[PDB]
Design an enzyme around this catalytic site. Structure first.
Site, mmCIF file in Angstrom:
data_model
loop_
_atom_site.group_PDB
_atom_site.id
_atom_site.type_symbol
_atom_site.label_atom_id
_atom_site.label_comp_id
_atom_site.label_asym_id
_atom_site.label_seq_id
_atom_site.Cartn_x
_atom_site.Cartn_y
_atom_site.Cartn_z
ATOM 1 N N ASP A 162 14.592 -4.779 12.370
ATOM 2 C CA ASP A 162 15.295 -3.626 11.831
ATOM 3 C C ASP A 162 14.472 -2.355 11.847
ATOM 4 O O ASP A 162 14.308 -1.686 10.830
ATOM 5 C CB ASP A 162 15.758 -3.938 10.402
ATOM 6 C CG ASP A 162 16.802 -2.959 9.890
ATOM 7 O OD1 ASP A 162 17.559 -2.386 10.703
ATOM 8 O OD2 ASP A 162 16.860 -2.767 8.659
ATOM 9 N N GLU A 172 0.903 -1.134 0.000
ATOM 10 C CA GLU A 172 0.000 0.000 0.000
ATOM 11 C C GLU A 172 0.954 1.198 0.000
ATOM 12 O O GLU A 172 2.032 1.128 0.588
ATOM 13 C CB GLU A 172 -0.880 -0.019 1.259
ATOM 14 C CG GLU A 172 -0.137 0.216 2.557
ATOM 15 C CD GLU A 172 -1.054 0.635 3.696
ATOM 16 O OE1 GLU A 172 -1.635 1.737 3.628
ATOM 17 O OE2 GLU A 172 -1.194 -0.136 4.666
ATOM 18 N N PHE A 173 0.574 2.283 -0.665
ATOM 19 C CA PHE A 173 1.429 3.464 -0.755
ATOM 20 C C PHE A 173 1.166 4.524 0.297
ATOM 21 O O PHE A 173 0.033 4.961 0.483
ATOM 22 C CB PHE A 173 1.280 4.096 -2.131
ATOM 23 C CG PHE A 173 2.055 5.359 -2.306
ATOM 24 C CD1 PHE A 173 3.437 5.322 -2.493
ATOM 25 C CD2 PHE A 173 1.409 6.586 -2.327
ATOM 26 C CE1 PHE A 173 4.167 6.485 -2.699
ATOM 27 C CE2 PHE A 173 2.136 7.773 -2.535
ATOM 28 C CZ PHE A 173 3.516 7.719 -2.721
HETATM 29 N N1 LIG Z 1 12.420 0.710 3.061
HETATM 30 C C1 LIG Z 1 11.257 0.301 2.594
HETATM 31 N N2 LIG Z 1 10.878 -0.979 2.497
HETATM 32 C C2 LIG Z 1 9.624 -0.971 1.983
HETATM 33 O O1 LIG Z 1 8.950 -1.985 1.747
HETATM 34 C C3 LIG Z 1 9.185 0.465 1.755
HETATM 35 C C4 LIG Z 1 7.976 0.989 1.285
HETATM 36 C C5 LIG Z 1 6.837 0.044 0.915
HETATM 37 C C6 LIG Z 1 5.537 0.371 1.628
HETATM 38 N N3 LIG Z 1 4.751 1.421 0.959
HETATM 39 C C7 LIG Z 1 5.149 2.697 0.604
HETATM 40 O O2 LIG Z 1 4.380 3.486 0.040
HETATM 41 C C8 LIG Z 1 6.513 3.164 0.888
HETATM 42 N N4 LIG Z 1 6.717 4.498 0.954
HETATM 43 C C9 LIG Z 1 8.002 4.728 1.231
HETATM 44 BR BR1 LIG Z 1 8.613 6.467 1.407
HETATM 45 C C10 LIG Z 1 8.698 3.562 1.352
HETATM 46 C C11 LIG Z 1 7.760 2.515 1.144
HETATM 47 N N5 LIG Z 1 10.329 1.171 2.155
#
Ligand SMILES: NC1=NC(=O)C(C2CCNC(=O)C3=NC(Br)=C[C@H]32)=N1
EC number: 2.7.11.22
Length: 274
Positions: free
Chosen positions: A118, A72-73
């Site tokens: 982490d 999801e974003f």
């Molecule tokens: N280091 C990261 N491992 C990840 O899986 C992500 C994501 C995936 C989840 N969904 C998103 O929209 C994100 N927005 C931003 Br900024 C980073 C990420 N970062």
């Protein structure tokens, strides 16, 4: 896979690069992570791990030696938000809501025998509704590494996640990383310099840890009121318990949620510049 349009690189996760994509079909906006058969089961167990405070893993697409995780974003991550408030500081009520939510998210993971491993500001995502979520579950920065990990403990517990969160909590309050180590030993010594070198008295069994060495300088614990000023006593009390050397003495996520500090917790909304 042919069902996605890379929009832009929104970062580089620990295990691979992350992009913002548009589902060519459903038009939905998501986050794609370009990544063994054991880890394929492993991450499929994650698909079922859903909670309001855990970034939703929408799908997994294993294809021609390339593994893709569709998430999801969320626009912003906590590191970016901390920089943007580095001059004014995140309001305490917001710090409190975030910590509370994260502890709720951790409590859920840990009750399912799942650890994060982490935790860091970069892997914590926020939205305009005031919500924070855990992202990037482990399967280069050591600033949030618990001491038992640093000392060679192979079978460490869910307590490592409480340690990491305690470090992030302190950073939100002071706007400065608690123990910014640049090496394994620098990280350990920075912890020692502040909380005092651990011994059999505060941590039974420490001297038997794999990487422990009697030659470690012996520093004394510093005034804790000098660690995260001007945090109130409720917060200082809670942080001290999250930073206990002994992993079995360290406060649990569930128990942390019952600390008086969250007596007045609320859910304020941030002011993001998306
Ligand atoms: N280091 C990261 N491992 C990840 O899986 C992500 C994501 C995936 C989840 N969904 C998103 O929209 C994100 N927005 C931003 Br900024 C980073 C990420 N970062």
């Amino acid at each position: 896979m042919e069902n996605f349009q890379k929009v832009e690189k929104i970062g580089e996760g620990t295990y691979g690069v992350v992009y913002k994509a548009r589902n060519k079909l459903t038009g939905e906006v998501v986050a794609l992570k370009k990544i063994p058969s054991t880890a394929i089961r492993e991450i499929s167990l994650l698909k079922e791990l859903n909670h309001p405070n855990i970034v939703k893993l929408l799908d997994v697409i294993h294809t021609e030696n390339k593994l893709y995780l569709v998430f999801e974003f969320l626009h912003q991550d906590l590191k970016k938000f901390m920089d943007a408030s580095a001059l004014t500081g995140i309001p305490l009520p917001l710090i409190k809501s975030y910590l509370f939510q994260l502890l709720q998210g951790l409590a859920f993971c840990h009750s399912h025998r799942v650890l994060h491993r982490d935790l860091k500001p970069q892997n914590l995502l926020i939205n305009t509704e005031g919500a924070i979520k855990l992202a990037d579950f482990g399967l280069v920065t050591l600033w949030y590494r618990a001491p038992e990990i640093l000392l060679g403990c192979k079978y460490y517990s869910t307590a490592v996640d409480i340690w990491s969160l305690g470090c992030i909590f302190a950073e939100m309050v002071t706007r400065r990383a608690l123990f910014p180590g640049d090496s394994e030993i620098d990280q350990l010594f920075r912890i020692f310099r502040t909380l005092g070198t651990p011994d059999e008295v505060v941590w039974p069994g420490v001297t038997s840890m794999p990487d422990y060495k009697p030659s470690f300088p012996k520093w004394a614990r510093q005034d804790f009121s000098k660690v995260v000023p001007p945090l109130d006593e409720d917060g200082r009390s809670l942080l001290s318990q999250m930073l206990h050397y002994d992993p079995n003495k360290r406060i649990s996520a569930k128990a942390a949620l019952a600390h008086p500090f969250f007596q007045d917790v609320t859910k304020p909304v941030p002011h993001l510049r998306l």
